[PDB]
Design a protein around this motif. Sequence first.
Motif, PDB file in Angstrom:
ATOM      1  N   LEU A  16       6.612  -8.048   2.329  1.00  0.00           N
ATOM      2  CA  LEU A  16       5.626  -8.559   2.800  1.00  0.00           C
ATOM      3  C   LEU A  16       5.453  -9.860   3.262  1.00  0.00           C
ATOM      4  CD1 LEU A  16       3.272  -6.164   0.789  1.00  0.00           C
ATOM      5  CD2 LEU A  16       3.356  -6.495   3.220  1.00  0.00           C
ATOM      6  N   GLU A  72      -0.735  -3.455   7.534  1.00  0.00           N
ATOM      7  CA  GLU A  72      -2.276  -4.163   7.056  1.00  0.00           C
ATOM      8  C   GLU A  72      -3.271  -3.565   7.599  1.00  0.00           C
ATOM      9  OE1 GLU A  72      -2.929  -8.083   5.484  1.00  0.00           O
ATOM     10  OE2 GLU A  72      -3.636  -8.153   7.962  1.00  0.00           O
ATOM     11  N   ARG A 112      -0.003   2.690  -0.865  1.00  0.00           N
ATOM     12  CA  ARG A 112      -1.060   1.617  -1.109  1.00  0.00           C
ATOM     13  C   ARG A 112      -1.188   1.377  -2.177  1.00  0.00           C
ATOM     14  NH1 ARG A 112      -2.927  -1.205   4.608  1.00  0.00           N
ATOM     15  NH2 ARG A 112      -4.121  -3.043   2.376  1.00  0.00           N
TER      16      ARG A 112
END
Lengths: 202, 196, 209
Positions: free
Chosen positions: C126, C184, C208
């Motif tokens: 990320l 995202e 997630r």
Amino acid sequence: EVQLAESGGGLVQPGGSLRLSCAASGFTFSTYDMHWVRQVTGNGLEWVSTIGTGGDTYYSDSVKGRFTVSRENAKNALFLQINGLRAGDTAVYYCARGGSGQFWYFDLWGRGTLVTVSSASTKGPSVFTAALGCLVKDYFPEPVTVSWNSGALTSGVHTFPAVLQSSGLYSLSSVVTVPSSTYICNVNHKPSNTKVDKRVEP
Amino acid sequence: TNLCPFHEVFNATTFASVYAWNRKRISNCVADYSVIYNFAPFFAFKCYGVSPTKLNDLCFTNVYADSFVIRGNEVSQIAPGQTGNIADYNYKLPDDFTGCVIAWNSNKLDSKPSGNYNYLYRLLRKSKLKPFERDISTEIYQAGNKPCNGVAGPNCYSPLQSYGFRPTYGVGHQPYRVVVLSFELLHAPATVCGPK
Amino acid sequence: DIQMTQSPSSLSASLGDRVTITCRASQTIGRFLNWYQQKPGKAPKLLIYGASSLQIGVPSRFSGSGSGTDFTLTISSLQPEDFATYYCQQSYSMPPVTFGQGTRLEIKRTVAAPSVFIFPPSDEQLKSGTASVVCLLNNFYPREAKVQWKVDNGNSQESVTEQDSKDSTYSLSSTLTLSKADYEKHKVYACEVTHQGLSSPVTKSFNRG
């Protein structure tokens, strides 16, 4: 032994010139014809060009116009000169010898010089019963691959062949199969003198 | 020593049309194969089941040359692969043709101010076609009821149409000249060898 | 211009099997067809020249023969050193000598069940905003598997490993490109699984959590 060599392998800019050679051993280079047959990475063979004993040159439809084969009986070495390369020419130009007879047949193939045509400058990768791994993104065509902590375990480690990303860089996705009913991955970037390590504790 | 008529086929200053099909049975040639390998940049040098590199060490009894002018779009079909109008009606190769087919661009010298004549092509003669056999018969083709008895005209416009080549730097399918070469070996000594 | 369409490359067989590699052309090429054997770890090598003549150093089981337009590089009994790719070539047209697409000889075993895994990227990946989706499929014998990316019930390629001679199985890994915030934005990313030999792969997706 009677073997065909090669040279001229390496990275080259798109459109730049390049020369490949093919040395002889044992046999008479001056009494046998020589051919070039390239193989795109993962694809099949594709004939490129050839020059006979009498110095007559022959090329292919997608090859003629910019390539130029050259033969020198001295040094027993076949040569191939290229001009204006492009992306569709990324292949291994296997040297080949033509045998005696009435039809063309290749009875001795060389080791194969690799040609990678691109302008992507050198860049370094990152380190970004179950199985996990360390996705080697932003890679480059290499002769050595990732080994998990100098290869401390080789039971369930899978090292997939390289893949090409959209930005032109290669990638690697080495994974390891571990019992699941915390290790460390060591990326090998020798062609640019780089090495890293990272733990895989979830 | 050094006697060959090969250069009498190339650079003829007037190439025969596809209807003419100018053959030339060439024998007693022991040189001049350089005019075949080294020449103007060839658009096509598609050889066949006789190795082009191995001719300089192999002797032939008969060397047959054939020349004609065809459109650049029809540079194909000069092969055992019979396909197309020029294949089915004009010119065709056998199944085991042992020779070479040479072609090159002729737009630089066959440019005409008006054009649309001096060269012909065939439309429909499927009822008659044989390899190495020119059909120069051009009386009339069967259509309607009556063959118009040689006084043809309106309502019997079935006969062939000639080429419409008039390139004035205004065509892409430019006309190309072709020199087909063939070889034969029979129960007779071979006379067309290479230079010694 | 002369085509050399070969038989489908998917020709699996075990040891001793009478494999028949058939390769045809667009027209008659006489006896000028010749085969080539290439193991994907070394240089190519020829097997049969003149379509009937055995190469020096090639055993008698490589009985590749034919006439006119039909040829069969038949191997009555295989060997562990025979598993490779085979290419046919025609010599009727001398300057444009053309090849075929090839045929891969692979070791046959039992249908192996795959172990599918799909794991979300940690903060380490990320750190790079344009992340990539991952999926894993290991130890599957039928090489005709397929991976589908119907997200939540930027395309990129995938890699398939060679036949791991220890277990005669195969592995597969997938990558998928995504732009900034393209990961995202959506919540659940699914790696839809499909394999001829492992049915009922209902749902395997990102978490997630």
